């Protein structure tokens, strides 16, 4: 079982749940403002250029 | 021919084990009593095709 | 070329080391060796019979594997038409190894050097003892056989029995049947005889010398009739050749029929040559210690340091030596170091935690040191000298000084 040096293992992922996640803001105490855009058909996230979903897998980008 | 090499091969690589503890065993007459008592009085049961004083299944 | 020969020797050493380790099941392996003079047909017949005998071996696993091993060697021998010079060596088998990999294997090769050893063996391992013995004994010896009939010159490795050159001569009669002429004929007879000795000596210079320095490490004169004596104690015989004359052997017979006789009688004296060279070497090393000098060094911790620096002239080692060069490596930081460890310090050692960082410093596997010396003594100063434990000075060097040291090219100071 001589494992080759340059091949090595391929590490799997490690998630990072960065505490409680925020998607809203408090406007005048009573009312609320939403930060990120939502699905049409659930927040479609802000990719650096794209707008990618996290469930139904829909995608968008304003050129 | 044949080398005097392996000399104490098996004595060497055997797995060493501690010799346990139990009791100061009975000696002299007392021992003989005890062995008399465990042939002739304690057990003396209904037979089931012969006995075995160090039996093990 | 000399360098190409050295590479081929190393390749075959490596090959032998791999074969020794092999191992397998029952008696599956087929260590086979053939001497150079031998006929291949004769070996092919032998193997065929051995195949026939194997064809009733009660076991399953053993039998089939052996048949297929003998089948393979027979096929290898069909590829040759003659046993090549140097002999042949054939190693067939069905080796077990890691990963449960029962792999078949066949290594025929014409070995470096003429070997004189036949061998057939079946076993669980390969029998590479004969080869290792031929690799060790590089000391060639020379053999001059004098006789009134005719001479012979030959050489002798541990096993191998060579014939270099020979001639015969039409020498005159012992007596002259005239009163006055008896004296003159006698003087003429002694001149003819001296010219024969002179001719022999010249032929010895031609043969045994190589680049104005004798190739043979020994030189046996054999024969009878105080003729070999005339050769050793004579001014015609060159001193550089004469200085290495080790025996004068009284034999019966003459020529090739006596050559083997002369070897048998001379065998004890020939084996002792290596032992004498050791005594001289270690004796020279221990001279430096007896006087102040400070050329000498000893122990891996010092001798290697000396070798790295202002180098050694001669590096002297025991044959066997335990000590081993490991390569230690770090998990996180990728820092590494190499150390030369004893049998107890190498087997189990809690030293090798990284400490400064705070991790387990894993010891990646060794290359054994004496082999290490052999690999790159050319890199350092040179003249790697292995010595035994047999001589009284040698036993001191092994037992006392740890079987490792060196005679240095100049004076060196040490500390700690």
């Amino acid at each position: 079982k001589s494992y080759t040096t340059p091949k090595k293992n391929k590490h799997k992922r490690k998630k990072v749940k960065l505490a409680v996640l925020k998607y809203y803001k408090v406007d005048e105490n009573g009312k609320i403002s939403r930060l990120r855009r939502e699905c049409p058909s659930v927040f479609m996230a802000s990719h650096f250029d794209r707008h990618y979903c996290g469930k139904c897998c829909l995608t968008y980008c304003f050129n | 021919h044949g080398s005097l090499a392996r000399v104490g091969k098996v004595r060497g690589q055997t797995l060493k084990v501690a010799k346990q503890e139990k009791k100061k065993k009975r000696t002299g007459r007392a021992k003989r009593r005890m062995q008399y008592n465990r042939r002739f009085v304690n057990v003396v049961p209904t037979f089931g095709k012969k006995k075995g004083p160090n039996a093990n299944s | 070329s000399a360098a190409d020969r050295n590479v081929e020797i190393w390749k075959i050493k490596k090959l032998i080391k791999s074969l020794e380790a092999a191992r397998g099941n029952g008696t599956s392996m087929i260590s086979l060796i053939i001497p150079p003079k031998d006929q291949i047909s004769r070996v092919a017949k032998m193997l065929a019979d051995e195949f026939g005998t194997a064809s009733n071996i009660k076991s399953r696993v053993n039998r089939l594997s052996v048949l297929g091993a003998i089948t393979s060697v027979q096929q290898r021998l069909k590829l040759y038409n003659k046993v090549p010079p140097n002999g042949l060596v054939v190693y067939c088998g069905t080796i077990v190894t890691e990963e449960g990999k029962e792999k078949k294997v066949n290594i025929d090769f014409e070995p470096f050097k003429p070997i004189n050893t036949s061998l057939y063996l079946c076993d669980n391992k390969f029998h590479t003892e004969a080869l290792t013995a031929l690799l060790s004994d590089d000391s060639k010896f020379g053999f001059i056989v004098i006789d009134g009939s005719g001479a012979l010159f030959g050489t002798l490795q541990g096993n191998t029995r060579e014939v270099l050159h020979k001639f015969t001569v039409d020498l005159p009669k012992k007596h002259g049947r005239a009163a006055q002429s008896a004296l003159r004929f006698a003087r003429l007879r002694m001149e003819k005889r001296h010219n024969y000795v002179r001719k022999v000596a010249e032929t010895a210079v031609q043969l045994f010398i190589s680049g104005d320095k004798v190739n043979v490490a020994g030189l046996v004169l054999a024969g009878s009739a105080d003729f070999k004596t005339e050769l050793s104690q004579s001014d015609m015989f060159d001193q550089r050749l004469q200085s290495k004359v080790l025996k004068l052997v009284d034999i019966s017979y003459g020529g090739e029929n006596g050559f083997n006789q002369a070897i048998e009688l001379s065998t004890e004296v020939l084996s002792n040559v290596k032992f004498i060279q050791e005594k001289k070497l270690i004796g020279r090393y221990f001279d430096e210690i007896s006087q102040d000098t400070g050329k000498y060094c000893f122990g891996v911790e010092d001798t290697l340091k000396a070798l790295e620096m202002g180098a050694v002239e001669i590096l002297i080692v025991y044959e066997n030596l335990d000590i081993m060069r490991y390569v230690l490596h770090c998990q996180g930081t990728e820092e590494e170091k190499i150390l030369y460890l004893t049998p107890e310090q190498e087997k189990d050692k809690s030293h090798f935690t990284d400490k400064e960082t705070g991790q387990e410093h894993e010891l990646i596997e060794s290359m054994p040191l004496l082999e290490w010396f052999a690999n790159n003594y050319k890199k350092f100063g040179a003249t790697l000298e292995i010595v035994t434990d047999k001589s009284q000075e040698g036993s001191q060097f092994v037992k006392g000084f740890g079987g490792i040291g060196g005679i240095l090219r100049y004076r060196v100071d040490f500390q700690g």
């Binding site: - | - | 007896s290 000893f298 122990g299 010092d302 037992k399 006392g400 000084f401 500390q415 700690g416």
Partner: protein
């Protein structure tokens, strides 16, 4: 049949000033063995004459000339009558004092002459190279030595020593010559001796 004896001159051996030394230059210690034991601390260096080669290196290194290594025959190891410390002097046998006969020791100094005189006086118990009186008497059987020591041990024989060093006597005793003789009378034979 030859063995070796290490000797450390305790007056000269000062382990603090020199450093460790011996260890560093000894080929048995550089191998990794207990041939020499020193450290910067502790007094005097110890050497195992078992493990010692007798290479003659440590003597050349040591800065004071503290160390010596000699060769003694292996026959003598059985017949050791005294050894005070490790890496020190080793006396073999004792002279055989005979009653009513004046024993004449002859031999150069520094060859265990004083220690023998002390043993025979009865000051020093023969440690016998161990470093016991029934064991000592059994060692000395078949010879007048066991007679001598048995005489010493129950009948308290009085050991008296005319000393070597005469110039140290004036700076100890006081008074006239006649007064000291008068004080030390037991036989009462001043005049005849005088």
């Amino acid at each position: 049949k030859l063995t070796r004896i290490a000797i450390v001159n305790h007056d000269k051996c000062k382990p603090k000033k020199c450093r460790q030394e011996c260890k560093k230059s000894c080929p048995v210690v550089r191998m990794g063995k207990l041939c020499i034991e020193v450290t910067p601390q502790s007094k005097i260096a110890w050497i195992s004459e078992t493990l010692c080669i007798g290479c003659g290196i440590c003597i050349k290194k040591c800065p004071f000339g503290a160390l010596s290594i000699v060769n003694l025959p292996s026959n003598l190891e059985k017949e050791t009558t005294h050894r005070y410390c490790a890496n020190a002097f080793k006396l073999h046998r004792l002279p055989i004092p005979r009653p009513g006969e004046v024993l004449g020791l002859v031999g150069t100094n520094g060859i265990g002459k004083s220690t023998a005189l002390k043993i025979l006086a009865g000051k020093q118990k023969p440690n016998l190279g161990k470093y016991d009186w029934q064991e000592i008497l059994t060692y000395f059987r078949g010879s007048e030595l066991q007679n001598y020591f048995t005489k010493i041990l129950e009948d308290d024989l009085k050991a008296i020593i005319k000393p070597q060093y005469v110039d140290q006597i004036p700076k100890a005793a006081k008074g006239t010559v006649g007064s000291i003789l008068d004080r030390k009378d037991e036989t009462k034979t001043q005049a005849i001796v005088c």
